[PDB]
Design a protein around this ligand. Structure first.
Ligand SMILES: CC(C)=CCN1C(=O)CSc2ccc(C(=O)C3=C(O)CCCC3=O)cc21
Ligand SMILES: CC(C)=CCN1C(=O)CSc2ccc(C(=O)C3=C(O)CCCC3=O)cc21
Ligand SMILES: [Co+2]
Ligand SMILES: [Co+2]
Lengths: 377, 377
């Protein structure tokens, strides 16, 4: 049952904004390691005395990296006169956020028909306001509400590139890197209690519901905005990875971004080539027993040679009644064992492909326990 | 005149420690962009609950990158029980430092015969103490005094790899990157007033003295520890780049690290190939007039083909009475227009090569003004 109960018209994931200590170095690392392109900037060179913000792009995926300058550069300004390109920015909030959680996602940003209506409707249905609707250069409206922890859901709407006050970087400083990543598939939040977190977000949005954790997934009408949310399952054998997150993150926050790749084989080859020269490390591979068993589960979908490629790259494979999902997980993206990244590609549900085709991999919890189980042998 | 008036036995530059928001991402960026090797770590995986520290190595050059974890991980510890591998570390100091100056150098570290004697003698000659002498695992003594701003001069001495509590990373996570950089040549500080800064550092060390600034250089007995210090020259046409530093840095701090390369041509080729894919940008090239004139200044030293290579890479060339210096400068290393890096190679003063052979490039201020001067033409 898809009740399509959204309370305002949501379109797509628009961007993810990281709050940094130093935006430059995270942006350069992420660019090289994910093959994302340096496409826009707002900083000193464009007259922003408040924050440094650098946008990376791959396909439809937009990663924004932001850090505060010294307040002494903008102590004279007031909000009416600000040189900030992003009006919700605040030195104190950014410094507090970062020193509390370390590097991670401040904003999950979705495009909507009308940011102002979306904010108003959201607040009227219980959303905590974070930044009111502000209109940028008669062209873009942006507003923010609290999602979970210090992560805000940012609404973005356009009259008719990224934001006013941002510049395009010309092709010379912009190396056309591309490892095949094309859009944001879903963003996952870790929370102390699932129940209330769900009730809060589905309450103001209208989104419907799509070892060591329970998890539910909230989705927009066409199910292209997918927001899973985890809670820890306490008391079990191995410590819950969700609780580990909450302890190292200092509370709730975004756990991982799933990035869709048009060719997860090329993406993972390119990313793995670069792991140890500035890129991202991947999580430990599953035992070969997992790939032996892959023929039984997915034989009618991937050839032996394709499945062979999966085991070279450590790619995981799940499937449900509608479709089949390929996935792999990076090790943490920075100092703390908190936020990480998933690479996914989905096979099926063709009509365009329906969002979430094949699920999110919960079968792979089971397939991995049993995987080692025989591997031990 | 070299009075060799050091007050304690100094050996070599030992390492440079960056204080980060996120040590991982700076360390990965610096590794790829400078071709430095991931050689040691102290962090959660080695039982440090206090800070994350990652050591990069190229030749004798050691870059250390450190960031604080959440205090909630070590709130139970006290200094006697600390899991920190670096005893001078302090969450509050690191967070304060970084939120004040942004990414930059916390510690210029030199090896000495006896860190404790060096600290004691230094304090008795006016040094401000920052961290007392602490002995690590009956093997290493480390102590810190204030150098300028929030930059400390760290003394390091060994009974007989980097530090106790650090692990070597095994060759698999350690890609043997190498672009030819071999040791730290000098570290330069920007200060509001040169006079008092000089008097303070030469006072406690015994080091002797070797447009828009005045600058003097302090040096150890064998002149292998070189510590230049700049002050702004106010009132001139173009704004002083030193004052710009002080305003964006929130006061005094380290301006640049000069890294000696055994083959500055290979280094700069490798670095430039990577500028726009995660590496470092370089400062604007000088006009060809500069390279036309190079034959007149340095014709008896570099061939036409070698000089040709210089103009491909934007390498600058200076020389004094003793030797000849090749140099180039990176754009800032992070968000703020503060700290940058110089690549140098020195020709001459062979006896081993004497430190500082050929100077530091002050002639190149003159050669560049006159360079454009005709270039404009
Ligand atoms: C990297 C770490 C520490 C854990 C991640 N992880 C694995 O390591 C191997 S199995 C695995 C299977 C699925 C997922 C996943 O993406 C998902 C959730 O689990 C909740 C529902 C929504 C959702 O998106 C993550 C997995
Ligand atoms: C990148 C920026 C903004 C300025 C740097 N710079 C140039 O840009 C071109 S000329 C130039 C020549 C020499 C030096 C230098 O290294 C030096 C000092 O100046 C003081 C004495 C000690 C010392 O080490 C730096 C230069
Ligand atoms: Co997922
Ligand atoms: Co220099």
């Amino acid at each position: 049952k898809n009740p399509k109960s959204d309370k305002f018209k949501v379109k797509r994931f628009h961007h993810i904004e990281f709050w940094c200590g130093d935006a430059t170095n995270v942006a350069r690392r992420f660019s090289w390691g994910l093959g994302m392109r340096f496409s826009a900037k707002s900083d000193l060179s464009t007259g922003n005395m408040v924050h440094a913000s650098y946008l990376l792009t791959s396909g439809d995926l937009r990663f924004l990296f932001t850090a505060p300058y010294s307040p002494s550069l903008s102590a004279g300004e007031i909000k009416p006169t600000t040189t900030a390109s992003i009006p919700s920015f605040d030195h104190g909030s950014c410094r507090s956020f970062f020193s509390s959680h370390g590097l991670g996602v401040r904003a999950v940003a979705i495009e909507v028909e009308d940011a102002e209506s979306a904010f108003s409707i959201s607040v009227a249905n219980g959303a905590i306001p974070s930044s009111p609707p502000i209109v940028l250069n008669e062209a873009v409206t942006i507003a923010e509400v609290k999602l979970y922890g210090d992560v805000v859901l940012r609404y973005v709407s356009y009259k008719a590139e990224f934001l006013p006050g941002f510049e395009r970087v010309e092709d010379a400083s912009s190396f056309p890197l591309d490892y095949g990543i094309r859009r944001l598939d879903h963003a996952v939040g870790n929370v102390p209690e699932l129940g209330p977190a769900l009730t809060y977000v589905a309450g103001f949005t209208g989104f419907h519901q799509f070892s060591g954790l329970n998890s539910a997934v909230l989705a927009s009408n066409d199910e292209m905005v997918l927001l899973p949310i985890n809670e820890p399952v306490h008391g079990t054998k191995r410590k819950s990875q969700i609780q580990t997150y909450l302890e190292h993150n200092e509370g709730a926050g975004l756990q991982h971004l799933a990035l869709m790749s048009e060719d997860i084989f090329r993406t993972l080859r390119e990313m793995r080539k670069r792991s140890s020269i500035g890129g991202f490390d991947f999580m430990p591979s599953p035992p070969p027993t997992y790939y032996q068993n892959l023929k039984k589960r997915v034989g009618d979908v991937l050839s032996d040679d394709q499945i062979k490629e999966c085991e070279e790259l450590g790619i995981l494979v799940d499937r449900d009644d509608q479709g089949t999902l390929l996935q792999i997980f990076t090790k943490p993206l920075g100092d703390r064992p908190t936020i990480f990244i998933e690479i996914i590609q989905r096979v099926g549900c063709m009509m365009y492909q329906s969002g979430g085709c094949g699920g999110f991999g919960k079968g792979n919890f089971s397939e991995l326990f049993k995987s080692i189980e025989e591997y031990e042998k």
